[PDB]
Structure 1
Amino acid sequence: GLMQFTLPVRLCKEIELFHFDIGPFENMWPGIFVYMVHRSCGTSCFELEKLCRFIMSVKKNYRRVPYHNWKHAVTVAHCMYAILQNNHTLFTDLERKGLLIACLCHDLDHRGFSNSYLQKFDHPLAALYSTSTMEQHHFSQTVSILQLEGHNIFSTLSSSEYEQVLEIIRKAIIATDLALYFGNRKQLEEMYQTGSLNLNNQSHRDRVIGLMMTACDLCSVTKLWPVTKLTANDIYAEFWAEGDEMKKLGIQPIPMMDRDKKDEVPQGQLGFYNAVAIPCYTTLTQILPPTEPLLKACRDNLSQWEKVIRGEE
C-alpha cells in the first residue's frame, strides 16, 4: 500500500511526454507499466501481487515477432497513459482501470499476420470469427488470462462493474481492427462539426475510446524520427513475411507486403500518414485538445518521409 514505484529522473520526466520511448531493457517494462497504473488510477485500484502475476502472464503470451511483441503492448499502453493524464477529469475510475489493461492486452498472441492472411490460409480462427478475426482472439486471450488463478485483478469490483470494465476492454480491443477505424472517424468528424458530439451518450464515449485506441496503436508514427524510422523496419519485416506466405499460397501480395518492392516504402508511408495517421490525430485533437502533441509529432514525421523521397536522406 505504501510501495510507490519510482523511476530514474530522466524516465520519471520523459514518461509524462507523448513521445516517450520505453527503451531497450525488457526487465524495466513491467515497472514502467505499474508506475503508469499507480499514477493514472491510484495505488488502490489493483492489488500489486495480482497485477504483477497478470502482467507476467500477458508478457508470456506475446510472441517473438519483429513488431507485434511485448514492447508494442507496453508502448501502446504508455500512449494511452499520456492521453489519460492530459485529460485528467474526462474519464471514469473504471475507464482508466480498463483502458490501460485493454492496451497491454490488445495484440495478445499475435503471429505477425493480417486478418486477410488468416482468411486466405483458411485458419481455424477465421471460421470461429468472420470479422475482426485476430481482435476477437486478443480479447478471448485477455479473458483466458483474467480467469487463471490469482490473476483476477478486478476481484474487488461488483458483478456490475466487472461486466462494464470487461465490456470497455472488449470494444477497446475490437476497435484496433483498422478496417473499423475509417467509418468510426467519419462518424466522429460529422458529430463534432454538426456539434452533436456528447460525452454523456455512452454510444459516443464508445466511439471516442475507439479513436483513442487507433491513436495509441498507431503511436510509433508520433515518436521522434529516429524511433519512427527504426520501428518502420520492424513493421515492414512482418509485412514482407506475410507477403512471402501469400506467395506460398499462390497469390501476388499487395506491394506494401512484397519485399521485392522495398523501393516503394517511403511513398507507402506517405499514403498511410495522408490516408490514416494524420486524419486520426486531427479528429482526436478536435475531440481532445490536449492530445495535440501527437498531431504535431505525426506531421513532423510525415515531413521527414517527404525528405526521404526527395533524396535528402
Structure 2
Amino acid sequence: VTAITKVEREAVLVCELPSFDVTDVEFDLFRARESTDKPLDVAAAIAYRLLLGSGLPQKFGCSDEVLLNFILQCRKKYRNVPYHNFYHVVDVCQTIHTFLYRGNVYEKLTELECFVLLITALVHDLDHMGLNNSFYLKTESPLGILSSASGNTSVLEVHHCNLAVEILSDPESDVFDGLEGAERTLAFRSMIDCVLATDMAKHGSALEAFLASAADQSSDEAAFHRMTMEIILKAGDISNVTKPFDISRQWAMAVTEEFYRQGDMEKERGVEVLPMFDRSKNMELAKGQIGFIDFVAAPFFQKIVDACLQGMQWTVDRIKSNRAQWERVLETR
C-alpha cells in the first residue's frame, strides 16, 4: 500500500469530460476512453465526478482528497485484461448511479447504503486475472486449493473482498473513516455481502430471496435493504445488455475475447474447455447475446422491475430492442 502522490491526483483533476453527462442512461464510456490519450485518468475522473455529484462523500466525512486516493488505490489493482479491467468497474459504478437516481432505487435505501453501493462498484472485481472461479478449481491452482480447503467456492469474490479491506485500513484511502460503531460495521458488512453476491453460482438463489422479500410486507427491513443492495450490484454487473446496441456490442466483444483466452490456457493445461470458451468454434455473437438475454438478463430485470423496481422499466425496454436488433442480424445473414 504505497501512498497516492500529488502528481497522480493532478493527472485526474485536470480531466474535464467536455460533452459527457455521466448521470445519463446513454453515457458512452467507450467514446470517453479514446477521447484522450489518458483513458485511465478519464475513467478515474468519471468515478470522482459520479461520487461527488451524488453529494454522499461530504455527508459521511470523506474529503475529496481521500475519495480520489481510494479511486486511485482501486485503479492500481486492476489488470490489462479485455473485460474485467478498471473500465468495467467504472461502468458498474455509473450504471448503479443511473439505477439509483434515474430509476429512483435511491428511495428504497438510506444515503449510507447508496454511498456504499457506489464505492463497492469500484472494488467488486479487484485483481481479476481474466479467469473464472471454475478455472482455478479444475486446474487445482493454489487459490482454488485454498478456497476448497477453506470451504468457500467463491474463489475470486473472496480475493476481491480481501483487497478492498487492504485499501480501507489506511486512513488516507478509507472512504469510511468518517463512520463509527454500527454505521462503520454496516458499511463493511454490506460492501462484503454485495461483492460475495456477484458470484453467478448464487444468481438463482439471490434473485429468489430478493423477490420473496419484496412480495412480503412483513420482511425484516434490514434484510430487505441488504438484498436490495446485492440485487443492484448484481444488476450493474449484468447491465451490458441494457445499454444502447453499439455499447452492448463492444462489451460483448470484450467479454468474448476474455473467455476465448481462458479457453487457450485450459487447452495448453489439458483441462475441460466449454463450447463458449473455444476460439475454434466461432460461435455467433448474435446467438450468444440472444442466449444471455433469454436465459439470464431479460427474466432478471423483468422480475425485479415487476416485484419492486418499477423505475428501472427502461432496462427491460432496452433488452427487448437489443434482442430484436440481434434477431435482425440473424434475419439478414
- Structure 1 and Structure 2 fold alike (TM over 0.5): yes
Within the alignment, does 1:21 sit opposite 2:28 as a pair?
Answer: yes
Q: Separation in 2 of the partners of 1:250 and 1:27?
A: 40
| 1:225 counterpart residue number | 245
Where do residues 151-300 of structure 1 align in structure 2 (5 Å cutoff)? 151-192=173-214, 195-196=215-216, 201-286=221-306, 287-300=308-321
Gap change, CA 1:191 and 1:51, over 3 Å in 2: closer
Q: Separation in 1 of the partners of 2:211 and 2:177?
A: 38
| 1:35 counterpart residue number | 49
Q: Separation in 2 of the partners of 1:5 and 1:78?
A: 20
Mind listing any 5+ residue stretches in structure 1 that lack a counterpart?
none
Mind listing any 5+ residue stretches in structure 2 that lack a counterpart?
1-12, 34-38
The Cα offsets for residues 98-148 of structure 1, whole Å up to 9 and x where unpaired, read as 111111110000001110001012122223333111011111111111123
Identity %: 28
Contact conserved, 1:108 with 1:141, CA < 8 A, in 2? yes
Where do residues 35-184 of structure 1 align in structure 2 (5 Å cutoff)? 35-42=49-56, 44=58, 45=60, 46-86=62-102, 87=104, 88-129=106-147, 130-148=152-170, 150-184=172-206
Contact conserved, 2:286 with 2:329, CA < 8 A, in 1? yes
Using the TM superposition, give the Cα deviation of residue 173 of structure 1 relative to its aligned residue in structure 2, in angstroms: 0.6
Gap change, CA 1:62 and 1:253, over 3 Å in 2: same
Contact conserved, 1:41 with 1:93, CA < 8 A, in 2? no
Gap change, CA 1:176 and 1:248, over 3 Å in 2: same
Q: CA RMSD in A?
A: 2.2
Within the alignment, does 1:311 sit opposite 2:332 as a pair?
Answer: yes
Helix, strand or coil for the counterpart of 1:263?
Answer: coil
Gap change, CA 1:242 and 1:103, over 3 Å in 2: same
The Cα offsets for residues 206-259 of structure 1, whole Å up to 9 and x where unpaired, read as 222222112101122111111111221110111011111211222341111111
Contact conserved, 1:185 with 1:280, CA < 8 A, in 2? yes
Gap change, CA 1:200 and 1:99, over 3 Å in 2: same
| 1:10 counterpart residue number | 19
Gap change, CA 1:283 and 1:36, over 3 Å in 2: same
Q: Separation in 1 of the partners of 2:219 and 2:153?
A: 28
Q: Separation in 2 of the partners of 1:191 and 1:57?
A: 36
Q: Which amino acid aligns with 2:26?
A: H
Deviant stretches of 4+, over 6 Å:
none
Gap change, CA 1:282 and 1:273, over 3 Å in 2: same
Paired residues in the alignment total 305
Q: Separation in 2 of the partners of 1:94 and 1:71?
A: 25
Q: Separation in 2 of the partners of 1:6 and 1:292?
A: 33
The Cα offsets for residues 143-169 of structure 1, whole Å up to 9 and x where unpaired, read as 111123511221121132111100110
Contact conserved, 2:171 with 2:177, CA < 8 A, in 1? no
Q: Which amino acid aligns with 1:258?
A: D
Q: Separation in 1 of the partners of 2:208 and 2:177?
A: 38
